[PDB]
PDB file of C-alpha atoms in Angstrom:
ATOM      1  CA  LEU A 986      -0.044   0.023   0.037  1.00  0.00           C
ATOM      2  CA  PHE A 987       3.102   2.099   0.519  1.00  0.00           C
ATOM      3  CA  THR A 988       5.142   0.890  -2.162  1.00  0.00           C
ATOM      4  CA  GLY A 989       5.383   4.517  -4.154  1.00  0.00           C
ATOM      5  CA  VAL A 990       4.531   7.790  -3.238  1.00  0.00           C
ATOM      6  CA  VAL A 991       0.859   8.235  -1.816  1.00  0.00           C
ATOM      7  CA  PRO A 992      -0.873  11.475  -1.171  1.00  0.00           C
ATOM      8  CA  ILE A 993      -1.204  12.909   2.086  1.00  0.00           C
ATOM      9  CA  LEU A 994      -3.941  15.274   3.668  1.00  0.00           C
ATOM     10  CA  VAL A 995      -3.205  16.640   6.998  1.00  0.00           C
ATOM     11  CA  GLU A 996      -6.528  18.305   8.958  1.00  0.00           C
ATOM     12  CA  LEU A 997      -6.247  19.963  12.475  1.00  0.00           C
ATOM     13  CA  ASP A 998      -8.886  21.759  14.872  1.00  0.00           C
ATOM     14  CA  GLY A 999      -6.879  23.382  17.242  1.00  0.00           C
ATOM     15  CA  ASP A1000      -7.497  25.130  20.695  1.00  0.00           C
ATOM     16  CA  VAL A1001      -4.367  26.498  22.864  1.00  0.00           C
ATOM     17  CA  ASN A1002      -5.366  28.880  25.712  1.00  0.00           C
ATOM     18  CA  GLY A1003      -8.870  28.964  24.101  1.00  0.00           C
ATOM     19  CA  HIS A1004      -7.082  30.651  20.942  1.00  0.00           C
ATOM     20  CA  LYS A1005      -8.673  28.544  17.925  1.00  0.00           C
ATOM     21  CA  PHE A1006      -7.180  27.615  14.900  1.00  0.00           C
ATOM     22  CA  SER A1007      -7.234  25.329  11.619  1.00  0.00           C
ATOM     23  CA  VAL A1008      -4.562  23.854  10.116  1.00  0.00           C
ATOM     24  CA  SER A1009      -4.776  22.109   6.779  1.00  0.00           C
ATOM     25  CA  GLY A1010      -1.755  20.401   4.913  1.00  0.00           C
ATOM     26  CA  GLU A1011      -1.127  18.286   1.688  1.00  0.00           C
ATOM     27  CA  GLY A1012       1.944  16.557   0.243  1.00  0.00           C
ATOM     28  CA  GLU A1013       3.140  13.385  -0.293  1.00  0.00           C
ATOM     29  CA  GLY A1014       5.343  10.916   1.446  1.00  0.00           C
ATOM     30  CA  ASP A1015       7.713   7.919   0.057  1.00  0.00           C
ATOM     31  CA  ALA A1016       8.155   5.082   2.663  1.00  0.00           C
ATOM     32  CA  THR A1017      10.609   3.198   0.613  1.00  0.00           C
ATOM     33  CA  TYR A1018      12.686   6.546   0.689  1.00  0.00           C
ATOM     34  CA  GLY A1019      11.616   7.390   4.097  1.00  0.00           C
ATOM     35  CA  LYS A1020      10.715  11.076   3.007  1.00  0.00           C
ATOM     36  CA  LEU A1021       7.697  13.288   3.530  1.00  0.00           C
ATOM     37  CA  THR A1022       7.110  16.788   1.575  1.00  0.00           C
ATOM     38  CA  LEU A1023       4.359  18.782   2.858  1.00  0.00           C
ATOM     39  CA  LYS A1024       2.858  22.174   3.153  1.00  0.00           C
ATOM     40  CA  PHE A1025       0.941  23.558   5.854  1.00  0.00           C
ATOM     41  CA  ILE A1026      -1.270  26.635   5.949  1.00  0.00           C
ATOM     42  CA  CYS A1027      -3.207  28.178   8.973  1.00  0.00           C
ATOM     43  CA  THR A1028      -6.964  28.711   7.699  1.00  0.00           C
ATOM     44  CA  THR A1029      -8.134  30.898  10.592  1.00  0.00           C
ATOM     45  CA  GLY A1030      -5.741  33.601  10.312  1.00  0.00           C
ATOM     46  CA  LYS A1031      -2.450  34.174  12.142  1.00  0.00           C
ATOM     47  CA  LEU A1032      -1.005  30.578  14.164  1.00  0.00           C
ATOM     48  CA  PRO A1033      -1.419  31.434  18.038  1.00  0.00           C
ATOM     49  CA  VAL A1034       1.432  28.992  18.843  1.00  0.00           C
ATOM     50  CA  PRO A1035       5.146  28.465  16.895  1.00  0.00           C
ATOM     51  CA  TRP A1036       5.109  26.397  14.121  1.00  0.00           C
ATOM     52  CA  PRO A1037       7.731  24.042  15.492  1.00  0.00           C
ATOM     53  CA  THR A1038       5.650  23.077  18.224  1.00  0.00           C
ATOM     54  CA  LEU A1039       3.066  21.420  15.672  1.00  0.00           C
ATOM     55  CA  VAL A1040       5.562  19.234  13.726  1.00  0.00           C
ATOM     56  CA  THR A1041       5.022  16.356  15.692  1.00  0.00           C
ATOM     57  CA  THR A1042       1.252  16.410  15.560  1.00  0.00           C
ATOM     58  CA  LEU A1043       0.575  17.411  12.186  1.00  0.00           C
ATOM     59  CA  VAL A1044       2.117  10.053  10.194  1.00  0.00           C
ATOM     60  CA  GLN A1045       4.926   7.460  11.087  1.00  0.00           C
ATOM     61  CA  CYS A1046       3.614   4.915   8.590  1.00  0.00           C
ATOM     62  CA  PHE A1047       5.963   6.822   6.156  1.00  0.00           C
ATOM     63  CA  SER A1048       9.180   5.876   8.147  1.00  0.00           C
ATOM     64  CA  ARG A1049      11.250   3.732   6.267  1.00  0.00           C
ATOM     65  CA  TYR A1050      11.774   0.038   8.032  1.00  0.00           C
ATOM     66  CA  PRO A1051      14.997  -1.472   6.629  1.00  0.00           C
ATOM     67  CA  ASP A1052      14.113  -5.009   4.793  1.00  0.00           C
ATOM     68  CA  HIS A1053      15.474  -6.760   7.993  1.00  0.00           C
ATOM     69  CA  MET A1054      12.905  -5.120  10.118  1.00  0.00           C
ATOM     70  CA  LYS A1055       9.789  -5.789   8.162  1.00  0.00           C
ATOM     71  CA  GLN A1056       8.494  -7.588  10.719  1.00  0.00           C
ATOM     72  CA  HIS A1057       8.439  -4.725  13.493  1.00  0.00           C
ATOM     73  CA  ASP A1058       6.459  -2.013  11.335  1.00  0.00           C
ATOM     74  CA  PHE A1059       3.200  -1.503  13.153  1.00  0.00           C
ATOM     75  CA  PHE A1060       2.306   1.546  11.408  1.00  0.00           C
ATOM     76  CA  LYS A1061       2.079   0.106   8.153  1.00  0.00           C
ATOM     77  CA  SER A1062       0.422  -3.234   9.349  1.00  0.00           C
ATOM     78  CA  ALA A1063      -2.291  -1.735  10.892  1.00  0.00           C
ATOM     79  CA  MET A1064      -3.405   0.199   7.393  1.00  0.00           C
ATOM     80  CA  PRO A1065      -5.856   0.900   5.830  1.00  0.00           C
ATOM     81  CA  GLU A1066      -8.072   0.091   8.754  1.00  0.00           C
ATOM     82  CA  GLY A1067      -5.508   2.449  10.363  1.00  0.00           C
ATOM     83  CA  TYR A1068      -4.873   3.490  13.790  1.00  0.00           C
ATOM     84  CA  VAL A1069      -5.673   6.174  16.442  1.00  0.00           C
ATOM     85  CA  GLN A1070      -2.823   8.361  17.634  1.00  0.00           C
ATOM     86  CA  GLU A1071      -2.672   9.866  21.007  1.00  0.00           C
ATOM     87  CA  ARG A1072      -0.341  11.973  23.093  1.00  0.00           C
ATOM     88  CA  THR A1073       0.220  14.477  25.721  1.00  0.00           C
ATOM     89  CA  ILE A1074       2.739  17.085  24.808  1.00  0.00           C
ATOM     90  CA  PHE A1075       4.503  18.572  28.269  1.00  0.00           C
ATOM     91  CA  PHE A1076       6.632  21.878  27.776  1.00  0.00           C
ATOM     92  CA  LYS A1077       9.255  21.854  30.389  1.00  0.00           C
ATOM     93  CA  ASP A1078       7.648  24.394  32.745  1.00  0.00           C
ATOM     94  CA  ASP A1079       4.961  25.832  30.492  1.00  0.00           C
ATOM     95  CA  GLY A1080       1.712  24.130  29.163  1.00  0.00           C
ATOM     96  CA  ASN A1081       0.824  20.983  27.563  1.00  0.00           C
ATOM     97  CA  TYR A1082      -1.067  19.567  24.728  1.00  0.00           C
ATOM     98  CA  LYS A1083      -3.037  16.317  24.441  1.00  0.00           C
ATOM     99  CA  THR A1084      -3.956  15.084  20.731  1.00  0.00           C
ATOM    100  CA  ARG A1085      -6.329  12.990  19.466  1.00  0.00           C
ATOM    101  CA  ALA A1086      -5.569  11.586  15.734  1.00  0.00           C
ATOM    102  CA  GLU A1087      -6.750   9.051  13.307  1.00  0.00           C
ATOM    103  CA  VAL A1088      -4.501   7.911  10.216  1.00  0.00           C
ATOM    104  CA  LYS A1089      -5.807   6.164   7.938  1.00  0.00           C
ATOM    105  CA  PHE A1090      -6.750   5.598   3.805  1.00  0.00           C
ATOM    106  CA  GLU A1091      -9.600   7.262   2.515  1.00  0.00           C
ATOM    107  CA  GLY A1092      -9.712   5.613  -0.915  1.00  0.00           C
ATOM    108  CA  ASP A1093      -6.244   6.375  -2.003  1.00  0.00           C
ATOM    109  CA  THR A1094      -5.132   9.254   0.151  1.00  0.00           C
ATOM    110  CA  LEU A1095      -3.437   8.800   3.656  1.00  0.00           C
ATOM    111  CA  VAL A1096      -5.463  11.212   5.882  1.00  0.00           C
ATOM    112  CA  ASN A1097      -4.513  12.308   9.583  1.00  0.00           C
ATOM    113  CA  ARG A1098      -7.134  14.022  10.966  1.00  0.00           C
ATOM    114  CA  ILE A1099      -6.236  15.677  14.304  1.00  0.00           C
ATOM    115  CA  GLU A1100      -7.908  17.272  17.575  1.00  0.00           C
ATOM    116  CA  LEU A1101      -5.477  19.359  19.342  1.00  0.00           C
ATOM    117  CA  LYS A1102      -6.197  21.127  23.004  1.00  0.00           C
ATOM    118  CA  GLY A1103      -3.380  23.336  24.823  1.00  0.00           C
ATOM    119  CA  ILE A1104      -3.789  24.548  28.458  1.00  0.00           C
ATOM    120  CA  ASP A1105      -1.774  26.414  30.667  1.00  0.00           C
ATOM    121  CA  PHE A1106       0.882  28.269  28.696  1.00  0.00           C
ATOM    122  CA  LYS A1107       2.261  31.729  29.657  1.00  0.00           C
ATOM    123  CA  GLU A1108       0.651  34.284  27.638  1.00  0.00           C
ATOM    124  CA  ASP A1109       4.374  35.447  27.472  1.00  0.00           C
ATOM    125  CA  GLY A1110       6.050  31.751  27.445  1.00  0.00           C
ATOM    126  CA  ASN A1111       8.415  30.676  24.796  1.00  0.00           C
ATOM    127  CA  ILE A1112       5.322  29.070  22.847  1.00  0.00           C
ATOM    128  CA  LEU A1113       2.616  31.982  23.689  1.00  0.00           C
ATOM    129  CA  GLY A1114       5.130  34.731  23.293  1.00  0.00           C
ATOM    130  CA  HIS A1115       6.714  32.836  20.012  1.00  0.00           C
ATOM    131  CA  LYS A1116      10.244  32.882  20.955  1.00  0.00           C
ATOM    132  CA  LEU A1117      11.104  29.498  19.250  1.00  0.00           C
ATOM    133  CA  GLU A1118      13.878  29.392  16.294  1.00  0.00           C
ATOM    134  CA  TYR A1119      11.898  28.526  13.051  1.00  0.00           C
ATOM    135  CA  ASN A1120      13.915  25.208  12.564  1.00  0.00           C
ATOM    136  CA  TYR A1121      14.417  21.398  14.153  1.00  0.00           C
ATOM    137  CA  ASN A1122      16.628  19.215  15.217  1.00  0.00           C
ATOM    138  CA  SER A1123      17.135  15.582  15.116  1.00  0.00           C
ATOM    139  CA  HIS A1124      15.125  13.348  17.387  1.00  0.00           C
ATOM    140  CA  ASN A1125      15.216   9.417  18.239  1.00  0.00           C
ATOM    141  CA  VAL A1126      11.658   8.326  18.720  1.00  0.00           C
ATOM    142  CA  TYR A1127      11.463   5.218  20.810  1.00  0.00           C
ATOM    143  CA  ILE A1128       8.958   2.259  20.332  1.00  0.00           C
ATOM    144  CA  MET A1129       8.052  -0.583  22.505  1.00  0.00           C
ATOM    145  CA  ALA A1130       5.653  -2.867  22.013  1.00  0.00           C
ATOM    146  CA  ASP A1131       2.076  -2.767  24.497  1.00  0.00           C
ATOM    147  CA  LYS A1132       0.696  -5.970  24.262  1.00  0.00           C
ATOM    148  CA  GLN A1133      -1.863  -5.384  26.976  1.00  0.00           C
ATOM    149  CA  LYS A1134      -2.949  -2.725  24.382  1.00  0.00           C
ATOM    150  CA  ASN A1135      -2.865  -4.515  21.255  1.00  0.00           C
ATOM    151  CA  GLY A1136      -0.650  -1.338  20.098  1.00  0.00           C
ATOM    152  CA  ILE A1137       2.535   0.467  20.704  1.00  0.00           C
ATOM    153  CA  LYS A1138       4.271   2.730  23.115  1.00  0.00           C
ATOM    154  CA  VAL A1139       6.394   5.594  22.007  1.00  0.00           C
ATOM    155  CA  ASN A1140       8.238   8.092  23.819  1.00  0.00           C
ATOM    156  CA  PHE A1141      10.947  11.023  23.380  1.00  0.00           C
ATOM    157  CA  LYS A1142      11.962  14.239  24.030  1.00  0.00           C
ATOM    158  CA  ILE A1143      11.887  17.294  21.387  1.00  0.00           C
ATOM    159  CA  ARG A1144      14.787  20.185  21.759  1.00  0.00           C
ATOM    160  CA  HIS A1145      12.967  23.531  20.392  1.00  0.00           C
ATOM    161  CA  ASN A1146      15.832  25.839  20.096  1.00  0.00           C
ATOM    162  CA  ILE A1147      15.145  29.118  21.456  1.00  0.00           C
ATOM    163  CA  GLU A1148      16.336  32.844  20.289  1.00  0.00           C
ATOM    164  CA  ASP A1149      18.492  33.522  23.178  1.00  0.00           C
ATOM    165  CA  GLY A1150      20.411  30.302  22.362  1.00  0.00           C
ATOM    166  CA  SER A1151      18.459  28.082  25.209  1.00  0.00           C
ATOM    167  CA  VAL A1152      16.591  25.242  24.600  1.00  0.00           C
ATOM    168  CA  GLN A1153      12.842  24.305  25.381  1.00  0.00           C
ATOM    169  CA  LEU A1154      12.035  21.133  25.946  1.00  0.00           C
ATOM    170  CA  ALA A1155       8.694  19.417  25.262  1.00  0.00           C
ATOM    171  CA  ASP A1156       8.541  15.388  26.872  1.00  0.00           C
ATOM    172  CA  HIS A1157       6.251  13.438  24.455  1.00  0.00           C
ATOM    173  CA  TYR A1158       3.909  10.653  25.664  1.00  0.00           C
ATOM    174  CA  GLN A1159       2.432   8.721  22.808  1.00  0.00           C
ATOM    175  CA  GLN A1160       0.293   5.650  22.333  1.00  0.00           C
ATOM    176  CA  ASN A1161      -0.813   3.917  19.161  1.00  0.00           C
ATOM    177  CA  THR A1162      -3.888   1.423  18.633  1.00  0.00           C
ATOM    178  CA  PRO A1163      -5.329  -0.263  15.333  1.00  0.00           C
ATOM    179  CA  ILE A1164      -8.528   0.887  14.172  1.00  0.00           C
ATOM    180  CA  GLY A1165      -9.627  -2.546  12.925  1.00  0.00           C
ATOM    181  CA  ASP A1166      -9.761  -6.149  13.875  1.00  0.00           C
ATOM    182  CA  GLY A1167      -7.303  -7.786  11.779  1.00  0.00           C
ATOM    183  CA  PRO A1168      -3.925  -8.844  13.485  1.00  0.00           C
ATOM    184  CA  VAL A1169      -1.358  -6.150  13.452  1.00  0.00           C
ATOM    185  CA  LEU A1170       2.535  -6.902  14.170  1.00  0.00           C
ATOM    186  CA  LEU A1171       3.772  -5.974  17.733  1.00  0.00           C
ATOM    187  CA  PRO A1172       7.337  -5.099  17.383  1.00  0.00           C
ATOM    188  CA  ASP A1173      10.751  -5.482  19.777  1.00  0.00           C
ATOM    189  CA  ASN A1174      12.191  -2.176  20.773  1.00  0.00           C
ATOM    190  CA  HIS A1175      13.570  -0.061  18.473  1.00  0.00           C
ATOM    191  CA  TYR A1176      13.636   3.728  17.330  1.00  0.00           C
ATOM    192  CA  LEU A1177      12.996   5.784  14.623  1.00  0.00           C
ATOM    193  CA  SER A1178      15.850   8.373  13.601  1.00  0.00           C
ATOM    194  CA  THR A1179      13.636  11.324  12.684  1.00  0.00           C
ATOM    195  CA  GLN A1180      15.062  14.595  10.831  1.00  0.00           C
ATOM    196  CA  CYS A1181      13.080  17.880   9.787  1.00  0.00           C
ATOM    197  CA  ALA A1182      13.582  20.950   7.791  1.00  0.00           C
ATOM    198  CA  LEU A1183      11.273  23.916   7.914  1.00  0.00           C
ATOM    199  CA  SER A1184      11.175  26.544   4.961  1.00  0.00           C
ATOM    200  CA  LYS A1185       8.468  29.254   3.864  1.00  0.00           C
ATOM    201  CA  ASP A1186       7.192  29.757   0.339  1.00  0.00           C
ATOM    202  CA  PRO A1187       8.130  33.303  -0.409  1.00  0.00           C
ATOM    203  CA  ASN A1188       5.064  33.579  -2.682  1.00  0.00           C
ATOM    204  CA  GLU A1189       2.807  32.681   0.141  1.00  0.00           C
ATOM    205  CA  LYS A1190       0.794  34.952   2.062  1.00  0.00           C
ATOM    206  CA  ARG A1191      -1.262  32.934   4.286  1.00  0.00           C
ATOM    207  CA  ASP A1192       0.354  31.671   7.655  1.00  0.00           C
ATOM    208  CA  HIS A1193       2.293  28.490   6.810  1.00  0.00           C
ATOM    209  CA  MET A1194       4.887  25.896   7.146  1.00  0.00           C
ATOM    210  CA  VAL A1195       6.641  24.141   4.472  1.00  0.00           C
ATOM    211  CA  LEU A1196       7.843  20.548   5.672  1.00  0.00           C
ATOM    212  CA  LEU A1197      10.367  18.096   4.414  1.00  0.00           C
ATOM    213  CA  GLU A1198      11.207  14.938   6.745  1.00  0.00           C
ATOM    214  CA  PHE A1199      13.532  12.242   6.768  1.00  0.00           C
ATOM    215  CA  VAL A1200      13.046   9.132   9.161  1.00  0.00           C
ATOM    216  CA  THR A1201      14.519   5.509   9.145  1.00  0.00           C
ATOM    217  CA  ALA A1202      13.514   3.053  11.323  1.00  0.00           C
ATOM    218  CA  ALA A1203      16.705   1.705  13.706  1.00  0.00           C
ATOM    219  CA  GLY A1204      18.089  -0.154  16.776  1.00  0.00           C
ATOM    220  CA  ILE A1205      17.493  -3.735  15.445  1.00  0.00           C
TER     221      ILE A1205
END
């Protein structure tokens, strides 16, 4: 199902400190290569948070699993019924985000529809004050099978660089469960080496983000 370059659609309904926003994205993902190229637009006006804080929220089934690791690919085995991705993201000494997402095949397109809710941000923090650098670092995303939940458990910490040269951590808690009843693959502990590059389309007027990403499953 992921043999070539597949069409991707991203739908985000957000509310951070009551500031509501919607974000729509489209693009393509190539699983064998381990690549994604997407563009995101804020369709409600100015985006109330920094773009980097939303990169993890806005489809790990596009990860490249080397041939000797096909057995451990939960994201793809759960397709096309898909899976529900849930998270709790904690910003060191600032607010948090709780997200619920369904990543599934709608006909020929892979769709990621998300609900995001963030509370407790300092109306002057690094987030609501926009003090984050418009960039992104590499991270390892840790996976553990979660037999009790016929799903997987994911953990990782994101380093967001702050203008002043310091770092703003965002501790991520994640779980993934199949939507359909067929048997999916429960993997052995491994990780995904993720890389993110953010740019801007000089011709775009709306609030937006151009994202290209490189992910390869490792540790096994």
